[PDB]
């Protein structure tokens, strides 16, 4: 069973940084001891602590990080994605609008697929979207993901620790309800990060905090100002039509937002123009 990784064939190279609920590292996997082996990414895990594994095991698509197996405190083993996160990539290269849109498209494809499998992500930001060699998008960090039971539209969870509240729709900040439409909001914020080249001083927490204290006063204030209709600003050099898309992803009421399935055509259309 090539889903079962043996400690004895796993040799560490680099730390790769941190995901939600565990460190990630690059390992060589050399079961036949051939001196070359295979590069893999391993996340060290550990109620619902194994949910990341259970969810990702069941996902297969070109725009989601590929599950490889586990090592029996548990280790999750995934494809290594060499270029890393969009958040560290974009500030360090010049990238064309047409290509930022293409990255946007691919996030939507994967998110549409994820939604079709009845999962929500709840952690969609540029820091968690990774790039492979051909600059293909792979969505990552499934630490916060949940299954939405059949014929329900949301899931209720109060996170005990940190979560990307600056990426979260009002219904999530206020009532701890997470809809499919909530990931669409997050994707709107993510679309903003791409267009601001993930400049740190343009970043959502940067911009939101400008308009604003304590950890949870911040959240109540942020909720208040989203409900009043205030939003991140148009990125410099961002086309009008694209700003419209983001604005649509940030409708206050979740039923107004477009779906990822809706977004694919629209992004394809704007990708040429
Ligand atoms: C400074 N940088 C960016 C790096 O040194 C670097 C370069 C490549 C690379 N590839 C890679 C990274 C992950 N990671 C990073 C941690 C995470 C989790 N969970 C992030 C989603 C949150 C995850 O899946 C997974 C598979 N391949 N990673 C890092």
Curated annotation (Swiss-Prot):
It comes from the Eukaryota. The active site is at residue 123. Changing residue 155 to F: Reduces basal catalytic activity and abolishes IFN-dependent activation. Observed in all cell lines analyzed. Expressed in a variety of lymphoid and non-lymphoid cell lines. ATP binds at residues 16-24, 43. Phosphorylated. Phosphorylation by JAK1 at Tyr-154 and Tyr-155 induces kinase activation. Residues 10-273 form the Protein kinase domain. Changing residue 43 to R: Complete loss of catalytic activity. Changing residue 154 to F: Reduces basal catalytic activity and abolishes IFN-dependent activation. Transmembrane segments: none annotated. The modification Phosphotyrosine is found at residues 154-155. Interacts (via FERM domain) with JAKMIP1. Interacts with PIK3R1; this interaction is important for cell migration. Interacts with MPL/TPOR. (Microbial infection) Interacts with Epstein-Barr virus protein LMP1; this interaction inhibits TYK2-mediated interferon signaling. Belongs to the protein kinase superfamily. Tyr protein kinase family. JAK subfamily. Tyrosine kinase of the non-receptor type involved in numerous cytokines and interferons signaling, which regulates cell growth, development, cell migration, innate and adaptive immunity. Plays both structural and catalytic roles in numerous interleukins and interferons (IFN-alpha/beta) signaling. Associates with heterodimeric cytokine receptor complexes and activates STAT family members including STAT1, STAT3, STAT4 or STAT6. It is linked to Immunodeficiency 35: A primary immunodeficiency characterized by recurrent skin abscesses, pneumonia, and highly elevated serum IgE. This is Non-receptor tyrosine-protein kinase TYK2. It comes from Homo sapiens.
